[PDB]
Symmetry: C2
Subunit: 385 residues, 2 copies
């Protein structure tokens, strides 16, 4: 049965995702308690209540579970044991078991395959013993590639020898060895699924990464035709159904030069590639998180306006280099752009690589949203390639 407006909802993690959840939840009349050990928590600052405590502090967890009728998550490395502890006393969506699958590169690959969705070529290496039982030819099948720890932790490798040495260099921990592929473009599907098994899919997003960090998202994905959108949406839903997932799920895919389509990873939460939904869709990804965790009907995902999203890293504050000190970006100039919606997360210190905000661009025509995002990237010195 539904948990109606006025109820306390809990959020494990108080970064920008938790912060944007607060606005969605409070707008609908819910109260939000954020658990985040950071005294400067961006989400905690704007929540109804902030429990300043560690993610494994049982007294804090009991207080959250006691106060809240449902709890969801945004923090990247949340211990599933904490979600377990919480679910003894309250409704937790997504469940710890789902979060644990999504947080482990081996589990996630195995699960997507089990859901009947093609996965990007890789070899699983659980241990030194598992590595010993793989011959050079077995490794060569996925090389050159990148060795990645299943749970920073990545090594580019070209030969079987480099692969063996890299595994030892990472301490022999569980890893996946991912083949480098002839990538054409990247897309993400973003879906909400409820406790009753009903789901709602957003449009397909096309994502550009720079130096391994999301830079630009365009929606609807320019490169993907109707059949591709449908294929990607159905894939994400199939995964969510197989997982018994309640919440927002983001699945990232590669489209290769040969036209093939492969899933690479998934996030058990609202995702950076979904921030456009706040300004471009009838229901945002944050509103869907609220609806899923309260067992309320899912919202209409209708995209009213074509959109682009430009990430704002801390690098934007360092036009004279990181060491020379912060310079406030020209936010007035950005606000003068008619397509722009400026989102800044209330983080105190700009640092290289740190996500400080984003700018959504909406317009009647997609080309105009994209041109505005491109011009803003030039203004702010944000590299797109």
């Amino acid at each position: 049965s539904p948990i109606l407006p006025g109820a306390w909802l809990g959020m494990v993690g108080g970064g920008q995702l938790g912060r944007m959840f607060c606005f969605a939840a409070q707008s609908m009349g819910y109260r939000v308690a954020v658990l985040d050990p950071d005294p400067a928590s961006p989400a905690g600052a704007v929540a109804d209540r902030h429990l300043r405590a560690a993610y494994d502090d049982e007294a804090a967890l009991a207080e959250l579970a006691g106060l809240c009728e449902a709890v969801s998550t945004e923090f990247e490395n949340v211990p599933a044991a904490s979600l377990d502890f919480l679910a003894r006393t309250t409704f937790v969506a997504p469940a710890g078991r789902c979060v644990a699958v999504a947080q482990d590169r081996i589990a996630e690959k195995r699960f997507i395959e089990a859901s009947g969705v093609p996965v990007a070529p890789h070899v699983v290496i659980e241990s030194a013993a598992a590595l010993a039982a793989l011959d050079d030819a077995a490794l060569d099948a996925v090389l050159p590639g990148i060795l990645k720890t299943a749970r920073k932790g990545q090594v580019r490798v070209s030969t079987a020898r480099e692969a063996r040495d890299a595994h030892a260099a990472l301490g022999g921990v569980p890893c996946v060895l991912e083949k480098r592929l002839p990538l054409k473009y990247e897309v993400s599907a973003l879906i909400a699924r409820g406790a009753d098994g009903r789901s709602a899919a957003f449009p397909l997003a096309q994502n550009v990464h720079h130096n391994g960090i999301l830079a630009l998202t365009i929606v609807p994905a320019p490169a993907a035709d109707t059949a591709r959108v449908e294929e990607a949406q159905q894939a994400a839903v199939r995964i969510a159904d197989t997982l018994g997932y309640v919440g927002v799920l983001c699945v990232e895919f590669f489209v290769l030069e040969d036209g093939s389509f492969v899933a690479n990873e998934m996030a058990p939460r609202p995702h950076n590639s979904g921030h456009y939904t706040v300004d471009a869709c009838a229901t945002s990804q944050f509103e869907q998180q609220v609806r899923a965790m309260t067992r309320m009907p899912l919202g209409n995902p209708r995209q009213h306006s074509p959109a682009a999203m430009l990430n704002i890293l801390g690098d934007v504050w360092f036009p004279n280099g990181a060491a020379a000190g912060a310079v406030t970006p020209p936010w007035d100039t950005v606000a003068a752009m008619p397509a722009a919606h400026l989102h800044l997360y209330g983080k105190e210190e700009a640092r290289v690589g740190r996500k400080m905000g984003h700018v959504n661009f909406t317009a009647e025509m997609r080309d105009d949203a994209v041109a505005a995002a491109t011009a803003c990237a030039q203004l702010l010195r944000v590299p797109l390639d």
Copy 2:
């Protein structure tokens, strides 16, 4: 003159639903908000970066707000202009006290709009018993039947008397103690509209579309945007009238001007609100920039946002009455918010107020759709579900 950029502290005098929705807009852009509101259960204070839980005339609280904030705006209906001018000693106050004061006095408001060259709804000003004694019956008959309204402090229907004859008008004035009043003629109304504009310190403005408003029992019930009854010329006329008033006032902020369109086609202004307005809540879900974002931009001397309406919209108000389907005395019943949330057009906004009371604004539901008729049909169905009369 310079812009007040993201990260700055912004103050809000008043912590009801308007201040709450202001907080979401301001915090999303990276500003920190301090709310001044004496109510310990302040809906805005609950979600603000800071809540100064203080009376509106508490000078210690006001000095702390002004010291902390680089700019301060207002939402509270009866804010003393003396408090705004106290604040303006040490911070940027937008809109200014003198603008707010004009809107709070029915006589000043009518006089100011006329002085701005915008036609005003027929009325007679009655400053005093002596002024009334010097008006002949024919002078009163010109605006009768009508409603006698106190000039000051008559919020939410207070200080008003329906009158039909000159004698009833004179008796009503004496009943109210002879205080300053306006006598407003009851007009042959065809429809009501509101214009909603933002104006900056640099004199630039940005106008939303024209909203058509339906009132019942003296309270806003339903808003539809764009106004179905207004053609392009009417939209432009109303927007330009609101900008003319704002320019004449030297107004910095969001201004809502409410008008009547009469059976004969006459277009007259009746009142203005020096703040975001209930008839503007649709902007949060229907426009590229909401009225609350424009309040942030205006008070920070930042460029105004694009007011583009991406989707046709309707808004249904939710009063505390919705909780009392068996009567006010019979006790509260939680409304079917799940059934509302199932409506694909609906956007549910509930304000976090603790006690449902008759006549109290507890929330609103915005409806957006590709087609206006569908948004209107959804609002009308939701009104039937919730037992909300629209006429």
